[PDB]
Write a protein that binds this ligand. Structure first.
Ligand SMILES: [Mg+2]
Ligand SMILES: [Mg+2]
Ligand SMILES: [Mg+2]
Ligand SMILES: [Mg+2]
Ligand SMILES: [Mg+2]
Ligand SMILES: [Mg+2]
Ligand SMILES: [Mg+2]
Ligand SMILES: [Mg+2]
Ligand SMILES: [Mg+2]
Ligand SMILES: [Mg+2]
Ligand SMILES: [Mg+2]
Ligand SMILES: [Mg+2]
Ligand SMILES: [Mg+2]
Ligand SMILES: [Mg+2]
Ligand SMILES: [Mg+2]
Ligand SMILES: [Mg+2]
Ligand SMILES: [Mg+2]
Ligand SMILES: [Mg+2]
Ligand SMILES: [Mg+2]
Ligand SMILES: [Mg+2]
Ligand SMILES: [Mg+2]
Ligand SMILES: [Mg+2]
Ligand SMILES: [Mg+2]
Ligand SMILES: [Mg+2]
Ligand SMILES: [Mg+2]
Ligand SMILES: [Mg+2]
Ligand SMILES: [Mg+2]
Ligand SMILES: [Mg+2]
Ligand SMILES: [Mg+2]
Ligand SMILES: [Mg+2]
Ligand SMILES: [Mg+2]
Ligand SMILES: [Mg+2]
Ligand SMILES: [Mg+2]
Ligand SMILES: [Mg+2]
Ligand SMILES: [Mg+2]
Ligand SMILES: [Mg+2]
Ligand SMILES: [Mg+2]
Ligand SMILES: [Mg+2]
Ligand SMILES: [Mg+2]
Ligand SMILES: [Mg+2]
Ligand SMILES: [Mg+2]
Ligand SMILES: [Mg+2]
Ligand SMILES: [Mg+2]
Ligand SMILES: [Mg+2]
Ligand SMILES: [Mg+2]
Ligand SMILES: [Mg+2]
Ligand SMILES: [Mg+2]
Ligand SMILES: [Mg+2]
Ligand SMILES: [Mg+2]
Ligand SMILES: [Mg+2]
Ligand SMILES: [Mg+2]
Ligand SMILES: [Mg+2]
Ligand SMILES: [Mg+2]
Ligand SMILES: [Mg+2]
Ligand SMILES: [Mg+2]
Ligand SMILES: [Mg+2]
Ligand SMILES: [Mg+2]
Ligand SMILES: [Mg+2]
Ligand SMILES: [Mg+2]
Ligand SMILES: [Mg+2]
Ligand SMILES: [Mg+2]
Ligand SMILES: [Mg+2]
Ligand SMILES: [Mg+2]
Ligand SMILES: [Mg+2]
Ligand SMILES: [Mg+2]
Ligand SMILES: [Mg+2]
Ligand SMILES: [Mg+2]
Ligand SMILES: [Mg+2]
Ligand SMILES: [Mg+2]
Lengths: 155, 208
RNA sequence: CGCAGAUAUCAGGAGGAACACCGGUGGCGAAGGCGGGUCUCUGGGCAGUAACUGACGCUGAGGAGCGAAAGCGUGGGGAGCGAACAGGAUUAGAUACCCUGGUAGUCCACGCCGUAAACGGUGGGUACUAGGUGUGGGUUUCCUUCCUUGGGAUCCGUGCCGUAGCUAACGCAUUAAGUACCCCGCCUGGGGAGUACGGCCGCAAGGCUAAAACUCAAAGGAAUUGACGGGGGCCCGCACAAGCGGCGGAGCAUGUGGAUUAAUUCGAUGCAACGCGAAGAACCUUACCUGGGUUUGACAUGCACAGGACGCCGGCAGAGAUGUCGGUUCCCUUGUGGCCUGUGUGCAGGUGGUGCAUGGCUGUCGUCAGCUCGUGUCGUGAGAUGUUGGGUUAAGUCCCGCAACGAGCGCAACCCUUGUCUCAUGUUGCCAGCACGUUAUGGUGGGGACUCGUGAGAGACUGCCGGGGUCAACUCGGAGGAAGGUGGGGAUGACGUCAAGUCAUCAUGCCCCUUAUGUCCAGGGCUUCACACAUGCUACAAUGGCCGGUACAAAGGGCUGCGAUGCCGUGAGGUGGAGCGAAUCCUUUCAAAGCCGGUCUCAGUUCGGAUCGGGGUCUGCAACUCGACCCCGUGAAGUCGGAGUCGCUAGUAAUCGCAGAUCAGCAACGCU
RNA sequence: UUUUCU
């Protein structure tokens, strides 16, 4: 990245529904590079969430991402032999990407015995505001507003 | 490693094979006999510089062509060395063996024989300084040749150390494939051990 | 230090030191030093008139005085600051750098000591030697407003840059380290030593004059290139940042360390050795250890004495070599050639040593862009310019002025592959369009209309346009095009550094054995382990284990080798053997993941498979140490992992397969 | 911040 900003790939859109968020989700959950397996699992879990909630899967996914997307983050910095943290604003695109990342992370590490149903249930919990993703967002915002004091560094 | 031999690097473009023959079943025996006879000839003939040895095989008949500095001792006026070589090949069981002598045009326009001469001068009594001076001057005098580089490695003057010295003049574009480079290598003997001499010669350019 | 009333703020009072803005490379004094204001006394300096004296001038050993801060004696005052000393915090140790407290002292009056890098490191006086450029003071003359750094002439003080000259160089330059004269001190190699004794001064601290023995063969002053920096400036790399998956916890396979053994043959030892030299250790390879033979010898050659035998196919003894016997015996031709059995003669023979002697080959700095020479010029000399500054690029690639003018190794190109098109081209390869098949598919007669495989040519050159640019390099954007600004990946290691690896590839100088460290064979070893490290596969379960159906590629190997169909085995494999020196016959119609259907509802698990027992196949004369494969029983550790640490920026990271190198048998999870 | 020795 020394020369300058590198070009960004033209990510494709999902033809099944019409939202590239599905493509982003499948790419993020790609494990061992099994595209067909990942997409079929994602579609099955989406249908499970749809039949569980009785609403529009796209609308509920939009609600979940809107609820969980942060706006402020924390960056580490050490000056004068001491380590400090500074809060820095984040672009909404990166906020959405990291929200998807946390969604995957907390859809990986719970004990519902079946991840196909469990990812749907995690989506419902995040939409309802009882999810581990929203808990993590709460913690991140709390840290950022606690370290607000050191914002003078501006980096 | 520092440099790959220009001969091997440029085989496919400028220089041609100095041996041509086809075989796959008796290929092992054929290569054994060729490498043998080559080594035996090399260890047998030392007085007269031999530039290259090329062998062509057609079924049973084999033809060997020899380039040497001067034919006086390579072939006798009655055929002394010729008959000795024939008897040698017959002992090696070359089947039908035919001998030809080809004479170089410019004695000091090529790497092998200048290397032989420099090695002999270094070995007997001559100092490497004068050796390089005379070799470079003689190589330059010929108009066709343009660039010459001579390198000597080993013990020089009997000192208990290794001196790596090279002298350069003219063209030495080994990276440029189009260029024409001639490569030679021989070992000079002495009381204290062995000395290796390497020389590079550039001769024009080829297009086509 | 406070919650007994702090910090903070408003009013008032007490007391000590020093004076910001003027204020400066400015002024004054001999040097130290000197600035809040008013008053009293006092020194010195410069300009002019030139009235007066009439050589009265410089210098200066001893001598006298002044003389920064620190310290001492006597007596006061003590706001702030603060040696010594207490504590707090870091460090392995802090008697310091950081912090909270604080006694001399810093002040005043009276006497003391008389020392500094008291440096402009350059004494005082006198007369002379091109200028330009600021600053303070005093007089004069003219554009003339006669205001005014308008300008002209002169004395003194203070800065900078500059010729002749001097200087070893740095440098000086009318305020000389320049040309000249008078006066005074100083020193003659470094330590010993400004030290000992004596003397003088002083209350003390202490200061002033200043020796000798001994010991060294250097000590120091200038300047040039490298190297170095926890110096600065300007830039690049998976170096960091955002991401992916890993190593370090379990099992197994290789290599090493460390310990045994008679041997575990030797070498390599951070980067740059550690799935190394071992692309295939039961004999061989091995050179290690025991034991049995051996002798100019297992194997070559020239000189004398003995000859036509040597060379070979078999029985007997033996751990084997080997010893003894059965069957053949010279090809030339008189000189002997070929060959070698017994004596030696030289000498063969050594993986015995020496990569600190070497040849050749190889790894890293690094695919980094730097590294040189000819002439000239400058300085004395080691040397400098070219290779400096600005702009631009992936690059010493290029443009602009410059004592430089040119060239070289490097960089790009020329070489391979991959991206397209055109022409030539039809078999063992394909089928446009026609006929024969009739379940077997171009299989068969036929056919270049495209790939198919190998020959020739074109196509990327900022090719064109608009803006920035010194009208130049170079850069952004746009149209055509397969590709746009080296399209992608490759072959391709400039001078040198690491005394880097390799006498165990080969050859090579020297030493060593020769009756052995050479040589043949029988068994054993390199695979030993109470531990450690490095690289890989299996995982640690559902994105999954297992069962049935089911479609998609490449390339290469095959003669003493691949191996068809068929038959028997769960399967290792057993019989057999079409087609093949190979676009044809085999390596299955080259598959795995992929898609559909069923079980498992999270367990030490239907995941996971090592260890230990019972049965067979295959190659080999020879499977116990010590090979591989098939069947069964056996059911251990292991639930994403500690600080630390590694690869990866597009067909990239991850995941799943196929063929080959060494090879009868494999250590094959390694390599290509 | 701190960071010993060849
Ligand atoms: Mg090149
Ligand atoms: Mg107050
Ligand atoms: Mg002073
Ligand atoms: Mg006065
Ligand atoms: Mg008068
Ligand atoms: Mg006094
Ligand atoms: Mg005082
Ligand atoms: Mg005192
Ligand atoms: Mg006092
Ligand atoms: Mg007192
Ligand atoms: Mg007080
Ligand atoms: Mg303390
Ligand atoms: Mg203090
Ligand atoms: Mg204090
Ligand atoms: Mg002094
Ligand atoms: Mg003077
Ligand atoms: Mg002046
Ligand atoms: Mg001068
Ligand atoms: Mg002088
Ligand atoms: Mg000088
Ligand atoms: Mg000057
Ligand atoms: Mg002066
Ligand atoms: Mg002395
Ligand atoms: Mg002294
Ligand atoms: Mg003294
Ligand atoms: Mg005394
Ligand atoms: Mg010196
Ligand atoms: Mg010096
Ligand atoms: Mg430095
Ligand atoms: Mg890179
Ligand atoms: Mg990282
Ligand atoms: Mg691991
Ligand atoms: Mg491990
Ligand atoms: Mg291994
Ligand atoms: Mg070893
Ligand atoms: Mg290792
Ligand atoms: Mg190691
Ligand atoms: Mg390896
Ligand atoms: Mg052995
Ligand atoms: Mg062995
Ligand atoms: Mg050795
Ligand atoms: Mg060595
Ligand atoms: Mg370098
Ligand atoms: Mg000169
Ligand atoms: Mg220079
Ligand atoms: Mg230079
Ligand atoms: Mg230049
Ligand atoms: Mg340079
Ligand atoms: Mg260059
Ligand atoms: Mg056809
Ligand atoms: Mg180099
Ligand atoms: Mg070395
Ligand atoms: Mg060495
Ligand atoms: Mg030797
Ligand atoms: Mg040798
Ligand atoms: Mg020896
Ligand atoms: Mg021996
Ligand atoms: Mg043996
Ligand atoms: Mg071994
Ligand atoms: Mg595996
Ligand atoms: Mg069977
Ligand atoms: Mg199949
Ligand atoms: Mg198992
Ligand atoms: Mg098991
Ligand atoms: Mg398995
Ligand atoms: Mg476990
Ligand atoms: Mg578990
Ligand atoms: Mg860690
Ligand atoms: Mg094998």
């Amino acid at each position: 990245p020394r020369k300058g900003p590198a070009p960004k790939r033209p990510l494709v859109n999902d033809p099944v529904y019409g939202s590239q968020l599905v493509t982003q989700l499948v790419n993020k959950v790609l494990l061992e590079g099994k595209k067909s397996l990942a997409e079929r699992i994602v579609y099955g879990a989406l249908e499970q969430a749809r039949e569980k909630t009785g609403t529009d899967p796209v609308v509920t996914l939009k609600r979940a991402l809107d609820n969980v997307k942060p706006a402020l983050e924390v960056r580490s910095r050490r000056v004068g032999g001491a380590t400090y943290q500074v809060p820095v604003e984040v672009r909404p695109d990166r906020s959405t990407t990291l929200a998807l990342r946390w969604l995957v992370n907390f859809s990986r590490q719970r004990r519902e015995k079946t991840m196909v149903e469990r990812l749907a249930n995690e989506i419902l919990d995040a939409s309802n505001g009882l999810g581990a993703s929203v808990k993590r967002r709460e913690d991140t915002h709390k840290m950022a507003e606690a370290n607000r004091a050191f914002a003078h560094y501006r980096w | 490693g520092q440099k790959i031999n220009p001969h091997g690097f440029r085989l496919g473009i400028t220089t041609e094979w100095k041996s041509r023959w086809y075989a796959d079943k008796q290929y092992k025996d054929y290569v054994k006999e060729d490498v043998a006879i080559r080594k035996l000839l090399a260890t047998g003939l030392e007085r007269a510089g031999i530039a290259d040895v090329e062998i062509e095989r057609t079924r049973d008949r084999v033809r060997v062509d020899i380039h040497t500095a001067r034919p006086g001792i390579v072939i006798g006026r009655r055929g002394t060395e010729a008959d000795r070589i024939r008897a040698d090949l017959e002992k090696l069981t070359g089947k039908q063996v035919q001998l030809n002598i080809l004479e170089v045009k410019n004695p000091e326009s090529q790497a092998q024989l200048v290397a032989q001469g420099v090695a002999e001068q270094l070995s007997n009594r001559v100092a490497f300084r004068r050796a390089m001076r005379k070799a470079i001057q003689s190589a330059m005098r010929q108009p066709n040749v343009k660039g010459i580089r001579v390198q000597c490695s080993g013990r020089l003057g009997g000192a208990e150390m290794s001196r790596s010295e090279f002298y350069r003049e003219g063209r030495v574009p080994l990276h440029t494939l189009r260029a024409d480079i001639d490569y030679g290598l021989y070992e000079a003997k002495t009381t204290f051990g062995r000395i290796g001499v390497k020389v590079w010669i550039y001769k024009g350019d080829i297009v086509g």
